[PDB]
Amino acid sequence: ALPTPHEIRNHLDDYVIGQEQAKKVLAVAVYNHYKRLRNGDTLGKSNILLIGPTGSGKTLLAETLARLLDVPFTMADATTLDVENIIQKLLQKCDYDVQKAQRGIVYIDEIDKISRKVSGEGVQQALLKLIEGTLQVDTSKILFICGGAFAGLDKVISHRVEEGELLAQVEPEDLIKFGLIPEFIGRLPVVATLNELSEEALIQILKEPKNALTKQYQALFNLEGVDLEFRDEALDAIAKKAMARKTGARGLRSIVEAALLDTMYDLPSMEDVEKVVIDESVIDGQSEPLLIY
């Protein structure tokens, strides 16, 4: 039984934060893709193009969709572009089941990088042959999600319409001028755009997601018999630390690990009830976390 786009967007809220619009677009595009396959067509390729800054959650979204639909997923990088190698990999994680491999999803990262603005354009066209569809499996059935930051894109759109509000006005012609070929863009009808993650959102990233850092460590400490408590001040501190380094959400783990290093070192050598991480432990880094016996 296929999950309504509602159920899809709902489950996406459990792994990714914000980007509600993009999650609606993806939810619909996805539902329609598998709704179209399960009825043997008779229809739209329904291929998707994700346009959002780095560390916005594009890859996470693609993966999440795959899991939510218990469907064979595989990544690939447009820079390393062998095109059929992606397919054999999809079969590898699919137990070599042709049909289940056709229901699969394929995420291509850094698409904006192959925009000729020779070999690059050649890749667009070579990969394009897949998008259409031709191991004996056909690539017509599999859904394609093409991520990318598209740096210069924010500019071309502005030179026409006259960041989020600007990416909403995105048009296929903007992608053309950017460096993508028409025949390639025409294969990516569904364009979902993500916003740059907010700073408070950072805190939500450390908390809300079912795989948030705090939850992982609270679990690591949990199998130690110890309860880890992150005070909101500490979480805000981590957010700021991450912003000052411009590392976005990618530089969150590098902060938490460094903050809980000493504590995780001599933790198994202790007997106490819980450890409490205050802001003083993060920002200053000089103060040791509160210990409770």
Add this chain to the structure above:
Amino acid sequence: ALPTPHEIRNHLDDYVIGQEQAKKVLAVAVYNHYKRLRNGDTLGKSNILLIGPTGSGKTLLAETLARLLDVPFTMADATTLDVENIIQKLLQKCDYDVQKAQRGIVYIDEIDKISRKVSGEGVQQALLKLIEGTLQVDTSKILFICGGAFAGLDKVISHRVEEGELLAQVEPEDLIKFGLIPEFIGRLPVVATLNELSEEALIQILKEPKNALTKQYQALFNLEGVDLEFRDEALDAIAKKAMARKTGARGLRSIVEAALLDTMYDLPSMEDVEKVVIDESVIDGQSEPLLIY
């Protein structure tokens, strides 16, 4: 029993719109090719060269011909040019049946791109060896359709005769000056030219074809128990939207999907009789489609 060129052109009208002349040329060229094969020659290679703007329907035509004659078809891109790889692929979709693979059709896209005006010319000659004919299958039997936009071609013809009226005056020498070698052009006797698709034709593209967008979605909505109605105003609106973006017919799906996004999102969560898409839903994009219970 071979279908008369009439039957062929007739069935081509069911997938492609306009290009009636090109469909006559293709119909004849095709009929003669398979009429020549089924009589074991004793004759003309009867190979075809499609010359039309991008998104004119060249690829669609080639595919359509293949299906109409239940004959093994395969594409290939002149830019990615391994030459025999195309053949093995033709055998892949042919169940490795030598004879049926010889009856096959092969479409080569972006031929105008390999026109030297070194490696490019080398490809013309390498691919030329196939056109003639030499797995054990011979490539003499298979029909070759070479598509291409031929941008500069419109110019050279003008510098001689002194867009459609100009492409009709096309001559093998024009292709020579364009960048094609004589021995290669002499293998493509049949030259069918397509016109740039008209704007009203756009509307016909959304309606007439048996795989038109409207029909696909009406079907997607149909298995939902809902009847989708496209008012002509909405279709004209879509046409205009596509023209303003210069994306031609390639930018039609990107419009329809965006227009039916919200509706397809919360459709499975509703119970009503039919949805009616008005022009207000397309152009303005602000108005939601009419809902009927």
Add this chain to the structure above:
Amino acid sequence: ALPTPHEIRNHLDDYVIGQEQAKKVLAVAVYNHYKRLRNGDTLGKSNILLIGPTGSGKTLLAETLARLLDVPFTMADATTLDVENIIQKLLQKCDYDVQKAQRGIVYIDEIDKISRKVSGEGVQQALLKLIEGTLQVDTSKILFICGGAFAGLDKVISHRVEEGELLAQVEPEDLIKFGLIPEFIGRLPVVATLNELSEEALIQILKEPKNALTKQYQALFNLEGVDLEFRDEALDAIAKKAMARKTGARGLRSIVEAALLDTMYDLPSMEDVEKVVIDESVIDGQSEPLLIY
């Protein structure tokens, strides 16, 4: 029983027109080659170098010789130069029979193109190793015919002797200065030169050959129950049309096909005795061919 050079030249007159001298040279060279093989040598390599403008009939001659002697034939292009690949191909069309593959003929096209005037010279020498002879088959036994237009050749010969009369004065040293290495030319003792095909010869090309265009179409129409009649005016018209385009004999089919397009389209939908193609049908292209019921 080996055919006397007379019988050979006689049968060559049935496929190729003119080039009588070249056909004498080839006839002798060929007879001597197979007369030398059938007696296990004890002798001259008797390898041949064809020098004639494009579309003169070099390839046709080579093929014709092969068929006339029921001997395994295969082509190859000096531009695509893997050298032993030609051999395996010769075995492919020979049922992998070593001896019959040694009796084979090998035509190398565009030899004049590999004349260094690095890699090119390297090909001359690599291919030279074959010419001498070394799968287990030896390439000493097989006859080598190396075609080529040799554009600049007409000039060097003139700078020495001081087009046909000039190509008759051809000397190994002329080929040296052209761009061929001595050790390579010394392997091609037999040099047959062809003349540029005459305009009236064009008409003869449309008629005389046993595979002439007129005969093929008269046959295509023949299995339709219809008799096709080409009036000499129409044939002369076709000749002129071909000359104005400088496409030589390569641009003949492209004319005839275009002329019989409409007629072949609605032919199977008619019931009449014969169609007669007049000059008005070719030159003007406006007049439809005479129809007789």
Add this chain to the structure above:
Amino acid sequence: ALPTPHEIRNHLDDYVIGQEQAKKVLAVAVYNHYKRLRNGDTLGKSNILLIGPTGSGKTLLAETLARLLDVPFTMADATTLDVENIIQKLLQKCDYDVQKAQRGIVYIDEIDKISRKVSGEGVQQALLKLIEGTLQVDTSKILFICGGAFAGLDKVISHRVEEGELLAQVEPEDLIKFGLIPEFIGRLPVVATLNELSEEALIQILKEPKNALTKQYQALFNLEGVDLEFRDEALDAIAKKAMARKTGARGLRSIVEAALLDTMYDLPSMEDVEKVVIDESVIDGQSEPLLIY
């Protein structure tokens, strides 16, 4: 039973000298990695980035960790970058056991060398695909330690904070400006930095380690029945000799071998109790080592 980070750092003191902080960081990072694997996650990649001058003991540390945890180890050089070849090698030393190969450790040397400040960045991204995880083994499970000297790094950090004290202030953004891509650095949360080895430490290097030079030779002489005695003066002499040549600890063996050459030459031809190496034997090199019968 997993060894507490204490036990880990303790055993690391038996092979590597100094770098106590780095050994704490590595100990924790390691303990957490295998503590996370043995509980089937539910967590942090816990990948490590070693930043220390050449001959600081980075490679030694990685190897030591591997042995201490009886886990399949393999090296690889970022300059020679085939990416999956490292994996097959890890399987080679793992008896092709998928699970045990997933518990493995992989050290990548000269990471600072691939910092683009095209192909280099491509390697970062290609290797990045491994770090994440995709033979059928998944590379997500295996721990990655990326060594490197990072010459210019000492500078960029200084241009921000305004050698050890400077490397302690290291930040992900410093690595960014250095030449590493964000998505790559975000995969290396754990950053352990080593100091340039001290000169007295040199003496400790010749003595303390369980594989110290003195111990090896004392053993080589030991199976000769002879006791080798290194006087502290000789060890200090060796230290100085090594410093004057700037060869660091890499130029220690080249000194000891040269010092014990003559003695090891005519040793098996003697009968005595022990040989004693004085400073006079090292610095001067003129004096022969004390011999005792």
Add this chain to the structure above:
Amino acid sequence: ALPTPHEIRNHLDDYVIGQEQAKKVLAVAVYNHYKRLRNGDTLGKSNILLIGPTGSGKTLLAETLARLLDVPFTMADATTLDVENIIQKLLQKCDYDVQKAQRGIVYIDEIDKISRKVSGEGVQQALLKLIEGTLQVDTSKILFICGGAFAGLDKVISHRVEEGELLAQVEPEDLIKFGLIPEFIGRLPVVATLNELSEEALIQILKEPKNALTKQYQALFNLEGVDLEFRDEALDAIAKKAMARKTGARGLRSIVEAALLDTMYDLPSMEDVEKVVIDESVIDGQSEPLLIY
């Protein structure tokens, strides 16, 4: 039983003309090589370096030696330089018999071409590894003959000693300055030099050799029942014709074939006793050869 150098030089006189000195050098070098092998060494590599103008008979000599000693022979071109490929080829013509393949001879042509005066020097060294000796066969046993024209060599020798008299003064240092590496020249102890073939020698080339042109054709005509007679005037005429074209002995066949073309054409269509070729038939080319019934 090994043939004395006398017997060797004697048999060499039956295929090659002149170059008596070179034939003495080769005879000795060869006798010593196989005299050294048949006694399992205990000695000199006894490798040979042929230095003579093109078409002097270097390749012919090497081949002749091989046949005379019923030993597996194979050629190779220094320009096409895969090094072990030569070996597998030697095994191909040796029935894959290791020992008999070790007794083999290997001729390398155009050695003077690989003289660096990067890749070239690399080939010298790569091929050098063979010369020394390392399929399981060892290349130490096989004799190496390295031919070459060495154009500039005639000059360097002159700049030192201060063409035949000059090539006799050849020294290893001359080859060094020419472009050969010392370690390579030291592997070619035996240096045999050939003179530029004389013009009267040309006539001897057409007569004396057991494979002379006259003998081949007299045989071709012989199996026709006809006796071919070459008058000395005709042979001298052929010699002159060849000299005027500077094609040396390589341009002899190209003359004889052209002279006997017409006659060999209508020969099988005649009944007569013998044909006699006079000078008038060659030089003038206008007069037909004398026919006798």
Add this chain to the structure above:
Amino acid sequence: ALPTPHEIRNHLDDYVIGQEQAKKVLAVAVYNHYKRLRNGDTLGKSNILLIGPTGSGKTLLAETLARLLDVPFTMADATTLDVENIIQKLLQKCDYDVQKAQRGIVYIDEIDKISRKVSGEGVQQALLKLIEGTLQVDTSKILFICGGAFAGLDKVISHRVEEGELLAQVEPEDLIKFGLIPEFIGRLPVVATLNELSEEALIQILKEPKNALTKQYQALFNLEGVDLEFRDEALDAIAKKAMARKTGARGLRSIVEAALLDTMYDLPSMEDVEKVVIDESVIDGQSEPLLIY
């Protein structure tokens, strides 16, 4: 039973002349390497770096060591740098015995050539991976001897210390500045240096070695029943001849062969007691060698 360094140096005196110091260094380094292996370590890699002019006897030494210890030996050229190919070759001459192949010796020639002063440095590092140790055989066990002339080395050492006396002052830092990477030099602790062979030594080279030229020929003549006598004058003459050509010891065979050519030619055709080579036979080359019946 392992041979004491004395026995080793003693046997080395039977093949190589002079270089006594280098033979002591090699003897020790070797003894220690196999003394360390036969005791399963517990120790020093004990890898060797030969530094001597071309034709000094580096390769000869390496080979000699291998034979003396009945251990699998194989060469390799740093210029041709596939790295594991050397290993498979070592297994080829080792009957594919893993253990015996680990006891093997590997000589790398022209190491000084790969000194970057990109690909070159890459080879140093790739080959470095072997030196350390990782077919299933480990390369840690096998001994590595890296030869090389190191031309510029004589200079850098001079610019520091302020040819033999200079090469004795060699230091790892000198090799660094030369073009070798630290991590590579640290793997070659044992540095043995050879002197340029003396002119009188040349005579000793023709006499002393158990494979000296004189002994080989005296043996070649010996199986002829003839005694060959080299008068010291002739040997000195050969020495001078070799020096005038600067070919060193590499140009000795090229002299002796040329001197005994005629004599070896008509030797098997004679019956006499002995031939005596005087100086007149060598220098003048005009006088024939004394013959005694």
